[PDB]
Design a protein around this ligand. Structure first.
Ligand SMILES: NC(=O)c1ccc[n+]([C@@H]2O[C@H](COP(=O)([O-])OP(=O)(O)OC[C@H]3O[C@@H](n4cnc5c(N)ncnc54)[C@H](OP(=O)(O)O)[C@@H]3O)[C@@H](O)[C@H]2O)c1
Ligand SMILES: NC(=O)[C@@H]1C[C@]2(NC(=O)NC2=O)c2cc(F)ccc2O1
Ligand SMILES: [Cl-]
Length: 316
């Protein structure tokens, strides 16, 4: 396996990065420091996570320390839904850059296809709990993203949580200047995404798998929910390979030509999750893991399900 995948902007992206959603601000600086020390070169960030300043402290220290060069890092962040307004995109990007202590991002993603009313609240609601949309056409948001490339703020742009008709709309945008480099979507053995991934790869868009361990720390977890990490069938595949179940869950998307971004704030697990470049799942193992699909989707925000661009009503 190569450690990096070539994007349609000509840059190479590490196929393993560190996720940072839910990483507490008093733990994420150490987590990212440890991650860089143990070989991670890709960090997945977002303004909505409320921890970019602390991620940035870690990145900056490792750069200052000359543990790594900036060109060796691949830092990803995202444009939140309340900033889809072509006069807010640049400022949102710049705030992320300032917090991360960077002068460019390697990749900046539209976090969701759904624009929300601008303001202080990340999920502005009406009195019945429905998110308040913005009217901004996503094609217009895409044009705003393209400007960020042309201004030097970001090396690549992409999308997240876009369904295939939404990807297609971007690809069919009149006057499209830059194709999306990446679509970042939920993907794991219970939500295998075969249809959406084949579509994206056919267009040359790299897919990043989020929540690859099934997000056991998701705030809405229930004790009765499915558990990838506890699935005896996955544990058996892991045992056959002398690996952990997490290592199998990370290697799985890698062998589908995906990028994968497991989150941890536990130093031992950070180091564990990186030890996935020295074994191979067989094709039979891969097909077996794929067979576990159930369309079990953990990120599906109820408040957004009436938004006209909500992505998950479409089959894929
Ligand atoms: N684009 C989007 O809309 C979107 C949505 C969701 C996620 N994401 C991105 O994808 C990242 C990963 O997804 P996620 O955070 O939802 O969940 P995840 O990576 O599937 O799971 C994280 C959980 O697994 C635990 N864990 C990590 N390694 C483990 C191991 N070796 N053994 C046992 N447990 C382990 C972590 O615990 P500890 O931290 O306590 O070690 C944490 O509770 C996010 O952090 C974010 O960067 C993006
Ligand atoms: N419910 C959902 O699906 C999303 C998931 C999500 N996680 C993530 O990384 N991107 C998201 O948008 C998230 C993150 C937040 F900081 C706050 C809410 C939130 O909800
Ligand atoms: Cl964001």
């Amino acid at each position: 396996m190569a450690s990096r995948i070539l994007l349609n902007n000509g840059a190479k992206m590490p196929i393993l990065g560190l996720g940072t959603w839910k990483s507490p601000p008093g733990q994420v600086t150490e987590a990212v420091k440890v991650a860089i020390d143990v070989g991670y070169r890709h960090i997945d960030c977002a303004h909505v996570y409320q921890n970019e300043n602390e991620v940035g402290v870690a990145i900056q220290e490792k750069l200052r320390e000359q543990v790594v060069k900036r060109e060796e890092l691949f830092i990803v962040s995202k444009l939140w839904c309340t900033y889809h307004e072509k006069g807010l995109v640049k400022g949102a990007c710049q705030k992320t850059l300032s917090d991360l202590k960077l002068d460019y991002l390697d990749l900046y993603l539209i976090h969701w296809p759904t624009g929300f009313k601008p303001g202080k609240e990340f999920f502005p609601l009406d009195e019945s709990g429905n998110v308040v949309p913005s009217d901004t056409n996503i094609l217009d948001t895409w044009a705003a993203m393209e400007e960020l490339v042309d201004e030097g703020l970001v090396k690549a742009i992409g999308i997240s949580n876009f369904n295939h008709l939404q990807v297609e709309m971007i690809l069919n945008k009149p006057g499209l200047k830059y194709k999306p480099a990446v679509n970042q979507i939920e993907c794991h053995p219970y939500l295998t995404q075969e249809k959406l991934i084949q579509y994206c790869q056919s267009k040359g868009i790299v897919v990043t798998a989020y929540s690859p361990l099934g997000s056991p720390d998701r705030p809405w977890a229930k004790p009765e929910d499915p558990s990838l990490l506890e699935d005896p069938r996955i544990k058996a595949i892991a045992a056959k390979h002398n690996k952990t179940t997490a290592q199998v869950l990370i290697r799985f998307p890698m062998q589908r030509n995906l990028v994968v971004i497991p989150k941890s704030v536990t130093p031992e697990r950070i180091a564990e999750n990186f030890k996935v470049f020295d074994f191979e799942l067989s094709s039979q193992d891969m097909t077996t893991l794929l067979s576990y699909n159930r369309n079990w989707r953990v990120c599906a925000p109820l408040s957004c399900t009436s938004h006209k661009d909500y992505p998950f009503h479409e089959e894929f």
